[PDB]
Each structure stands twice: as C-alpha cells, then as structure tokens.
Design a protein around this ligand. Structure first.
Ligand SMILES: *C/C=C(\C)c1ccc(N(C)C)s1
Length: 133
C-alpha cells in the first residue's frame, strides 16, 4: 500500500518532545509545540511528492522526488543544512537526512485508512498516527 495521498489528521503523538529536544529546539518553542494537533497534507504522483506539515504554530513544506538526492535547509524547524533522500523499503517511505545529527529522518506507511509516521533524530523516536480525512 504505497498511496499516501490525502489530508491526514493527527490521532496520536508519542515522544514529540524528545524528538524536538534532539534537534535542540528551544524550550519556549517545545513547550508550545508539544501541545498541538498536527495535520499532514500529501500530494503524490509517481515519484513526485509535495508534503505539508501544519499546526497552529508551524507550516513545514517539502517537495521531493523519490530516489533523487536533494540538498535541504530545514528552515523554521532547526535551521540546518542536510542532504536528504527519500526511498521505498517495501511500502515504507523512508527519508534519511545526512548532516550534523545522527539517525535523522522519518518513515511513513499506511495501515487501512491511517498513516503511521516515525520521526527520528539521535536516539529519539517520535511515533504518530493520522486518520485520512
Ligand atoms: C513526512 C513528515 C515530515 C516531512 C515532517 C516535517 C516536520 C514534522 N513535524 C514538526 C511533526 S513532520
């Protein structure tokens, strides 16, 4: 199941604060951001993806082509330069962001009408579940 198209509304969020701490996000931002429900909008056509992560506090958008490395500035998240690559491991979409932080990236996959996400950085893992709206 590779079709991740849709507007995805958060149902569950685990260890989001630990992931933000691993990125060195400042105290004030974390305390506010950890409270918030997230939305994920994914536009997927072949290898081309357009991903938007939103809350009332942020809007993080990235476009990429599966299998094509891209240099990336992580902008309002943590203002770092990484070399990013998104690929398929079966039906798990896997992103690796090479740079200052170890084990940095994410994984997304579908189960039923839900989208599961792992956000990793350092020794931290944030687990999220979204429902298709
Ligand atoms: C596929 C998920 C992303 C590209 C995300 C970028 C920032 C996120 N959060 C702050 C939750 S998710």
């Amino acid at each position: 199941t590779r079709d991740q198209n849709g507007t995805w509304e958060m149902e569950s969020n685990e260890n989001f604060e630990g992931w933000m701490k691993a990125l060195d996000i400042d105290f004030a931002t974390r305390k506010i951001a950890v409270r918030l429900t997230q939305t994920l909008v994914i536009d997927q056509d072949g290898d081309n993806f357009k991903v938007k992560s939103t809350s009332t506090f942020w809007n993080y958008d990235v476009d990429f082509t599966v299998g094509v490395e891209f240099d990336e500035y992580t902008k309002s998240l943590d203002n770092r330069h990484v070399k990013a690559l998104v690929t398929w491991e079966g039906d798990v979409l896997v992103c690796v962001q090479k740079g200052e932080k170890e084990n940095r990236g994410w994984k997304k996959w579908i189960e039923g009408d839900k989208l599961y996400e792992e956000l990793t950085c350092g020794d931290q893992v944030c687990r999220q579940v979204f429902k298709k709206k």
